[PDB]
Amino acid sequence: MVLSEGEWQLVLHVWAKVEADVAGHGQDILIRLFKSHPETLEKFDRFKHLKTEAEMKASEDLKKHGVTVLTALGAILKKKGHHEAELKPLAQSHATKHKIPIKYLEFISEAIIHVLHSRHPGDFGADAQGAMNKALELFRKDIAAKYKELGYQG
Ligand code: HEM
C-alpha cells in the first residue's frame, strides 16, 4: 500500500528470479490460478477448453499468455508504486473488456505467491512473501481505484 524501500528491494530481488524464467513462472501461475479457482478459467475463451493440468502445461498459448501477464506485472512492480500510467490500460481492459472482478486479482496474487514458493523454496522466505503480498495488494487496491475511476465495480 506504501512499501518501504526494503520491501520494494525484496520484491524486485524476487522479480529478478521470475525474470529468469518468465514463461515457466507465467505458465505455473496461470495453471495454479485455474486449478485453485476454475471459475477464472471460464474467463479465457482461448483456454476454457483445457482441463487437466497436463493439458494446460502443454498449451503453448497458455504459456505465452503467462509471459504477457508477468511482463505486464513486472513493468508495474519495477515502478514501485509509481505505476498509475501502467495500470490504466490494464484496468481499462480488465474492467471493461475482460470484465474481471478484483477478487480474481486476489486469486492470481495467491497463485503468484504459491508459485514463487514452489519455484524458489529457499529464496522466498517470510520477509519476501510479506513484501510481495504487500506489493500485490497495492497493485490490487490501485487497480480497484482505477476500476472506480472508469465507473466500474463494487
Ligand atoms: C497480475 C494480474 C494480471 C495482469 C498483469 C494481467 C495482464 C494482462 C495483459 C497484459 C493482457 C493482454 C492485454 C489485455 O487484454 O489487457 C491480459 C489479457 C487478459 N486477462 Fe489479464 N492480467 C491479470 C489478471 C487477470 C485475471 C486474474 C484474469 C481472469 C481471471 C484475467 C483475464 C484476462 C483475459 C480474459 C484476458 C484476455 C486474454 C485473451 O485474449 O485470451 N487477467 N491480461
What experimental approach yielded this model? Answer: X-ray
Pocket residue to mutate for ligand 1, from 39, 94, 147, most atoms within 8 A of Cβ: 94
| Three-state helix/strand/coil letters over the chain | CCCCHHHHHHHHHHHHHHCCCHHHHHHHHHHHHHHHCHHHHCCCCCCCCCCCHHHHHCCHHHHHHHHHHHHHHHHHHHCCCCCHHHHHHHHHHHHHHHCCCHHHHHHHHHHHHHHHHHHCCCCCCHHHHHHHHHHHHHHHHHHHHHHHHCCCCC
Q: Is 120 annotated as ligand-binding?
A: no
Resolution (A): 2.0
* 25 assigned binding-site residue: no
Pocket of ligand 1 contains residue 72 by CB under 6 Å: yes
* Binding site membership of 44 for ligand 1 (Cβ less than 6 Å): yes
Q: How far, in Å, from the CA of 86 to the mean position of ligand 1?
A: 14
Domains of the chain: 1-154 (1.10.490.10)
Of all protein residues, whose CA lies closest to atom 12 belonging to ligand 1? Answer: 68
